[PDB]
């Protein structure tokens, strides 16, 4: 492939960290809509890591933007279940967060 210049980690090079499954999709992105993000969760976070490592700003923006929409409109419990997050708070330090949030207009 040519398309390579969209990766800053190549324009500075004038890849043992990314698997072929992700590299092929990194490559297929750089043929230059959002149906490309119809990907599963595991490979989405692998695509974020690859986009950062390969320093493709455009890809990273889109992939992280997708994760933002994934958080959007979900209750704390639902965010935890979507991303397999353990609830790290004491009842005291959670009501601290809940109290802090009340100082900002929605």
């Amino acid at each position: 492939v040519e398309v390579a210049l969209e990766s800053q980690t190549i324009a500075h090079m004038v890849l043992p960290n990314v698997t072929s499954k992700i590299l092929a999709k990194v490559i297929e992105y750089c043929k230059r809509d959002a149906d490309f993000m119809k990907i599963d969760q595991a490979t989405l976070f692998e695509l974020i890591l690859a986009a950062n490592y390969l320093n493709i700003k455009n890809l990273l923006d889109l992939t992280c933007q997708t994760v933002a929409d994934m958080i959007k409109g979900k209750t704390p419990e639902e965010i935890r279940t979507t991303f397999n997050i353990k609830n790290d708070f004491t009842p005291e330090e959670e009501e601290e967060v809940r109290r802090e949030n009340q100082w900002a207009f929605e």
Binding site: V67, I71, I85
Partner: protein, 581 residues
Amino acid sequence: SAILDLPEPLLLHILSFLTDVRSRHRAALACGRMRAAERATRSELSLRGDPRSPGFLFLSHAFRFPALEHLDLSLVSPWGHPLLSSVPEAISEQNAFIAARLAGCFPAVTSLAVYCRDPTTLANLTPHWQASLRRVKLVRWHQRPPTLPDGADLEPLLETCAALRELDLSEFYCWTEDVVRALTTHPSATAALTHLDLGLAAATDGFKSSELGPIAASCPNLRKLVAPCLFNPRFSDCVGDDALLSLATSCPRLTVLRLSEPFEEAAITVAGLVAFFAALPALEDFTMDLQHNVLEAAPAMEALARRCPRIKFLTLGSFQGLCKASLDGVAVCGGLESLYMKNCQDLTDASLAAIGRGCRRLAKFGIHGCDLVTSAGIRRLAFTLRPTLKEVTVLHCRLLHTAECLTALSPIRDRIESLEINCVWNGSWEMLRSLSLWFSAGQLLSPLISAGLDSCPVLEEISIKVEPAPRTIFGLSDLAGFPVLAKMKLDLSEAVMDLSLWERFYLHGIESLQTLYELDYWPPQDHRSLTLPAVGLIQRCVGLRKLFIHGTTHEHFMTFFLSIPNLRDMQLREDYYPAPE
């Protein structure tokens, strides 16, 4: 957790995209790490509650927003009260503490909005942000304290804030005299200024020519100016051709210029506008929204197209002969994405056809009070501009009635995103996100769903502004058809206890709207007060999270929370001149 396995910078990057305030708040509650991610990436905050209380002051060191750029303090409780004022030596000690705490929570503020009752508010806050503060918005609907020297209200800002570039006095009542003296006596601050909104809470007879002159002269670096001007030629100090040419030569960097006259021929001639546009090559955004007329304006529009190639946003009030098809005038401005035309009495169907061919890039189109335009004009335009036209405003055009106007806009029904119409009664709106409706008093909403607008699958916000039988209701319940309708502006401030019958007329059936989330309500005027039937009806809105009444209620505000299961944001905001206490 695959999200928490990521390097922290990337979790932050994810959170930087989440703009919904409630969603951010929920994300922060998810885990201690996303709390860190949310706090560190929040760009803006509108402060809710009273920062004077110990409840704010003794919050955690964790309540911190290192990347916060815009802080809004204008909505703090109680609404519109003096914040950090001095009007003995004990109070300055506590003011210093509150200010320092705000600096602790929000160390990086570059854009500030504040309710400024008197200069001391600004004198207290600004030292903490003076190195970083670039935009300051002032809010005051209360009368300017009569005992202040001229320009005292802006004095603290122009002395301290060396980074200041943008000043937003659009909703800040003071006198024009105040703005002049301040901006003409602080040259080191004023010569840096690039943005200036001088709306002055829309309670001014306009800036005079001998006021506009010295402000422009003191600000060589202006790029945006928004200002009410006295355009009325009955007064000799009005803004004419001379004031315009001086504005252009004083501010040769102006890219955005929006002048309007607070509501015969104006002291502004075509030849003076040609000279004016000749001196402003980088003009992108031009508004001249006048009550008095500028006659045979086409040659000046051609000069605009010739001399200001960057021109994209055009709004003209009382300009006559803007386009007549014998391409003419405004139709030669090919770069236009936005065209708005108020009170063009000789604008015809032939004009719209000519605008259709000439202005290929048009996405926003508006006509107000152009009484020669028919459904045919609109039909042709909506058809010609199909690949681009997404926003339409049709207001008070005599030959254009709601039913036939909605049929005229059918060429783009599946594409139109924003609509603004006034209702006059003589298939899916696929993309329509936003709607604005204007009514006469005692006029029914109900026939709107028959005249068109049957199904609006993506309509999330509606705005209703009003400029009579015993049992008849306005019929808000007929908006229960619209599935995702969440926000509503119900403005009855200019609609007219005695008022209880009008409030009931308009508000009846608001409970039907299952998905109503945010409500901005403006009660009818003579100290604007909600009646009990209105309170009783808004109580029934179980879906409400946000409720902002503009005026007052003697009925306990706590009743609303105990009624509405999920009401969080509630405030009485007397954001009109002049505000009470």
